[PDB]
Symmetry: C3
Subunit: 30 residues, 3 copies
Amino acid sequence: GELAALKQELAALKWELAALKEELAALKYG
Amino acid sequence: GELAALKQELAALKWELAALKEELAALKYG
Amino acid sequence: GELAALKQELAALKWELAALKEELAALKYG
Ligand code: NA
Ligand code: NA
Ligand code: NA
């Protein structure tokens, strides 16, 4: 499961990056 | 295969992280 | 070697995203 674990971590990091972008947009415009 | 796909995803995530940093910095300095 | 390098990059990106979360919280507070 070594590659599968890295794939799951990358998917989580991609979700966290999207959430940070949404938080920055809220700060910029809100 | 799987390792090539993970390498490509990591490269894209690093590019989008740099883009987020630049936007955040621009907001902070502005 | 490539798997080890990708694991190291993903671990670093976790810390980078946490630091960006802290910067966004500071912008919220400022
Ligand atoms: Na085994
Ligand atoms: Na999603
Ligand atoms: Na902090």
